Amino acid sequence: DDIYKAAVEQLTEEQKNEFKAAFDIFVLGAEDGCISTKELGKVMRMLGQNPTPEELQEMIDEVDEDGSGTVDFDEFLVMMVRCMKDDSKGKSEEELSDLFRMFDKNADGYIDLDELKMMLQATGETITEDDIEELMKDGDKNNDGRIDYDEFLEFMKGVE
Amino acid sequence: TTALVCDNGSGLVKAGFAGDDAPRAVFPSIVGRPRHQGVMVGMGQKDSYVGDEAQSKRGILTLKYPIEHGIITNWDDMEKIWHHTFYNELRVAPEEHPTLLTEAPLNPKANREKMTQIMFETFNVPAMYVAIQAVLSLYASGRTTGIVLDSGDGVTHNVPIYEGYALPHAIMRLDLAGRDLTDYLMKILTERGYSFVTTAEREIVRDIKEKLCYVALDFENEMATAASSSSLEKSYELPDGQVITIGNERFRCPETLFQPSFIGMESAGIHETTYNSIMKCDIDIRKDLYANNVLSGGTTMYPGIADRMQKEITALAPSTMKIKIIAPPERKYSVWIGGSILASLSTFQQMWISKQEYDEAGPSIVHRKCF
Amino acid sequence: TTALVCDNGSGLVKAGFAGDDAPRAVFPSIVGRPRHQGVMVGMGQKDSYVGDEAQSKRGILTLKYPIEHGIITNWDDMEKIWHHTFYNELRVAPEEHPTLLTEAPLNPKANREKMTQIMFETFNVPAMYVAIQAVLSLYASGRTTGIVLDSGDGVTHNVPIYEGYALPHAIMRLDLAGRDLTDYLMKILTERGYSFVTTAEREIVRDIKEKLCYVALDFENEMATAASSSSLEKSYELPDGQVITIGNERFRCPETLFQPSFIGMESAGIHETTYNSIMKCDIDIRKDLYANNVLSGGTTMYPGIADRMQKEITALAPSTMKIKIIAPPERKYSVWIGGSILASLSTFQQMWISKQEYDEAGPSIVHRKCF
Amino acid sequence: GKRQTEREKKKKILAERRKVLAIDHLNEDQLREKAKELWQSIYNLEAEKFDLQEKFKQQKYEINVLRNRINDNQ
Amino acid sequence: ISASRKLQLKTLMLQIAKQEMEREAEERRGEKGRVLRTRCQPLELDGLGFEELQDLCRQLHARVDKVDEERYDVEAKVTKNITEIADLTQKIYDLRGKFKRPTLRRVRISADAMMQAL
Ligand SMILES: Nc1ncnc2c1ncn2[C@@H]1O[C@H](COP(=O)(O)OP(=O)(O)O)[C@@H](O)[C@H]1O
Ligand SMILES: Nc1ncnc2c1ncn2[C@@H]1O[C@H](COP(=O)(O)OP(=O)(O)O)[C@@H](O)[C@H]1O
Ligand SMILES: [Mg+2]
Numbered sequence A: 001d002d003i004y005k006a007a008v009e010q011l012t013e014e015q016k017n018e019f020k021a022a023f024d025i026f027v028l029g030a031e032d033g034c035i036s037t038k039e040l041g042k043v044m045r046m047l048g049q050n051p052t053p054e055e056l057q058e059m060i061d062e063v064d065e066d067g068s069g070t071v072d073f074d075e076f077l078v079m080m081v082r083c084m085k086d087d088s089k090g091k092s093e094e095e096l097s098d099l100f101r102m103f104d105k106n107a108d109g110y111i112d113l114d115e116l117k118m119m120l121q122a123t124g125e126t127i128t129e130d131d132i133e134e135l136m137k138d139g140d141k142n143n144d145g146r147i148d149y150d151e152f153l154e155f156m157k158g159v160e
Numbered sequence B, C: 001t002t003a004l005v006c007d008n009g010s011g012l013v014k015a016g017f018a019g020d021d022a023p024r025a026v027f028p029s030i031v032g033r034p035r036h037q038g039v040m041v042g043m044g045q046k047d048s049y050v051g052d053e054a055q056s057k058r059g060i061l062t063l064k065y066p067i068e069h070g071i072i073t074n075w076d077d078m079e080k081i082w083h084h085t086f087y088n089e090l091r092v093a094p095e096e097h098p099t100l101l102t103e104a105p106l107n108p109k110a111n112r113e114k115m116t117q118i119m120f121e122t123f124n125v126p127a128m129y130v131a132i133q134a135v136l137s138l139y140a141s142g143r144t145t146g147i148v149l150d151s152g153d154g155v156t157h158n159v160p161i162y163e164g165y166a167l168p169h170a171i172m173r174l175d176l177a178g179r180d181l182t183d184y185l186m187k188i189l190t191e192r193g194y195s196f197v198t199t200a201e202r203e204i205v206r207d208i209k210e211k212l213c214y215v216a217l218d219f220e221n222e223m224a225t226a227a228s229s230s231s232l233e234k235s236y237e238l239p240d241g242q243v244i245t246i247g248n249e250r251f252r253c254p255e256t257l258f259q260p261s262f263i264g265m266e267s268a269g270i271h272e273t274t275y276n277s278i279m280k281c282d283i284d285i286r287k288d289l290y291a292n293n294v295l296s297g298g299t300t301m302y303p304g305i306a307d308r309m310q311k312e313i314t315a316l317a318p319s320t321m322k323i324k325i326i327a328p329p330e331r332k333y334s335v336w337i338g339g340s341i342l343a344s345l346s347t348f349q350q351m352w353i354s355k356q357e358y359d360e361a362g363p364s365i366v367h368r369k370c371f
Numbered sequence D: 001g002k003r004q005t006e007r008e009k010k011k012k013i014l015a016e017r018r019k020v021l022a023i024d025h026l027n028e029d030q031l032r033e034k035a036k037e038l039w040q041s042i043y044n045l046e047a048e049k050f051d052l053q054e055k056f057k058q059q060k061y062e063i064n065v066l067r068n069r070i071n072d073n074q
Numbered sequence E: 001i002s003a004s005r006k007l008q009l010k011t012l013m014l015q016i017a018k019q020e021m022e023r024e025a026e027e028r029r030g031e032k033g034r035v036l037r038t039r040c041q042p043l044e045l046d047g048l049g050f051e052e053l054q055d056l057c058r059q060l061h062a063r064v065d066k067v068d069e070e071r072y073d074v075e076a077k078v079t080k081n082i083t084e085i086a087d088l089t090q091k092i093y094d095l096r097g098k099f100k101r102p103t104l105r106r107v108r109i110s111a112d113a114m115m116q117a118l
């Protein structure tokens, strides 16, 4: 949400001028000022580095939550710097190990579906039936019916 | 705390905590150094793969068993095997657990003394006790009498027991066992064209022996039948294809047990050393030993041995006595189940060789009252 | 600092700094002195054009490769090629960069020793290391097992590797490669009227081979089809016009790989030396080698070879094993990518042959522990 | 090799561990003060020993975790 | 398949785990203090004869020796455990490096730089 508004707030006009120079081709004229996301596919390719098309669509549909199809220069700025690396260092490896140890409250060295289910139920967050199986794929990377240290580390890979 | 019932054996190390039904970790006892050069850097190549890990990388190793015939011939490798067993297959430090090793009858003293010295100095256990491999197999059957034939993979020994009183003058230990049968099978397979030479291919021949061989009820009739029909030829797929067909090698490999003249051994088969072991006993306990003949050990798992042995003994024994052969389905782990039962007893809890006792009398304590 | 991953090869020298994806400068390894007299004064005519410069003035030069079959036959020209590679194509003085040459298996010792002596005395590098051209190609695939067939332009060699342990007794080196295919194509083109003789026109025949030839899935059916229809005849424009039409010479040139009897060589094709190299390995790692057959080198870029080879091996191999042929799209530079990966490793950083070590033991240090 | 080596090592460690023991031969007040000090010393010793027990438990769990991970490689 | 919501769940569970670890450490500290008070009895010895002083002192000395002995034992245990932790951590790191470093490189760093220099 507005978390990435604060994240993009760090860069001042120093990158804003470059972003506007890149975006000027996006506003190639004969437009009513709506500024869709049509050129964004190559706009994210302005310097060469471009993420997955799935992530491109995620960024496209994620912003402009009103559905206006209008690209705010702030929205374009935060989405293009989203191509730049932006993470809060993903906690600490010792910290993550302690987190998984707490996760492995059964002390079994593994987390099944029920362990993670209770872990997130303690949060009280609403989780769909369409989920869980998604979490099953995300966690059981080995398809071994449990969550391992490598699987947890990938699951929590640099997430903060 | 709980006791560790280890059972060194020769061919498969079986271990687990006392009081369960089956050993927790069963894995071959082989230590194989790599033999080729190795060009990939940083692959994390170790210097010796032990246990079940060396049965998967056996293509580039030279596996060598550290226990030849009951006795231990390579103490460093045996120490490595024990260290692996304690730390990686059970993950329990030995500083907090009594141990109950097992040893074949009539073994050299130095082997047993070195075993106890290792267990007390290197692994530093609280207390260890060494037991004869046949008394445990008699425990597991729930009997208290009977003559047990424990045909392992290293050595076949035949300990008669009556009313709990072992008869030390009637133990007949014979050194033919599963390993010699593997070598003989590997030697007779060459009569069809299949040559297995490498120490890794001995494992393949062992698998062939386990899955295909069986003991014939009557040897000459089977030899005549296999030479006329072709109803016996069973095929088997090597680890790379090229299926092989075993003909009358099927029942000729385990026949060596009843005719040790095949591999050049002089002694009589396992069908006649049991009768000799009985006849050395007193005249009044022979009926009970006849009726309670017990089989144990891995090599007695051949399909059809409990009938061949009964037929042979009935031929030898007097016609009036009843001959019965106890062959429980859990034959392979019979010794370890008996070991668990013995370690779980309350009456046995004061027979352990406590460490302070070893400190006062040295390793020669094992031959003393604490047997 | 960064390491220089040079790769002499035979036909194309590929070089670049360690840690990248592709070699920085790739250029043919030919040194051609002018052969005519020369009348213009002050034109600035040099005495030897090397590298890619002599592929543009090849009309009045006599190009001659300094590397015949892996081995180096003309040391002065090879020194000239190395000097060009360091100073003009990379523009980095060698006094401040380690080097990682590559060498075919089973090559003469004197070649390797002279190579290290040159690198240490003339160019005066800090430290150099020589690696076998197949292990690198196995690095690039991200595997750790597999049997790699590296059919370069000089020599085709087939090194099997398991779990990082190379098998030195199963390396099958065959001297048929891209150059012999170029000569055979130049020899069969004469059946239509086109005669290429000059050493400059060998380059034109090489271009024809690269752009038109392909490996037939089934040889006899293609020979029958090309002799009835005309759907195969593809035309090509020489460097001066006069287009030529290649008929069934298209798949007959690269067929020599699978039937070396065409150019009079006795040995078996690349489809059968791989199976022989596998069968020399132990019986327990043959499945893994069957499943991880790797192709590399330039000459394995013919359209349709990854299917012909798989069909042939599946015909030879037992029916149960799965045959899989890894043919990455970056085949040509596979050896150099692997070289970059190996030079970028931290574990490898202490294997270089440091100059003080060479000063103490002479050029024969390369055969020693620092391989 | 832990038959005399470890035993003598720990014996020496205990010997040097013990400090001076000459107290009750003094005036009552300072003796009471120092006895209270030594009770607090034993108290901190017990607290630290419990901390060592908990750290050992956590490190044993981590060793189980590392063994589990290295077994997860196969 | 939503991914932003999955990221929300990931971060939120991370925060929840942080809070749970905090409260668990707090409970651990409370239990440690309670057990320490439980095991080490406090003694009051006001207005007592010197003989009782000698008895209390000697008992305290013996308890000091015993506690230092237990501390030595658990310290040896912890040193061995830390050695094993370091060794196995190194081994797992080597395994991960073997699995991953072959996939690390600098792709297209200068390959795209070759447009028209030739
Ligand atoms: N199912 C089986 N059929 C035939 N032979 C077997 C079977 N299982 C094991 N064996 C033989 O028994 C041996 C294992 O015997 P075991 O009882 O483990 O010896 P030990 O007394 O040393 O433990 C193997 O080497 C194998 O040759
Ligand atoms: N696209 C291609 N199609 C067919 N053959 C090729 C192709 N590219 C290169 N070759 C052949 O491979 C040779 C280059 O092989 P290369 O791998 O450079 O040898 P080296 O191992 O000495 O580097 C050339 O001589 C050419 O005959
Ligand atoms: Mg046994």
Ligand SMILES: [Mg+2]
Residues within 6 Å of the ligand: C009, C010, C133, C150, C152, C153, C297, C298, C335
């Ligand atoms: Mg090459």
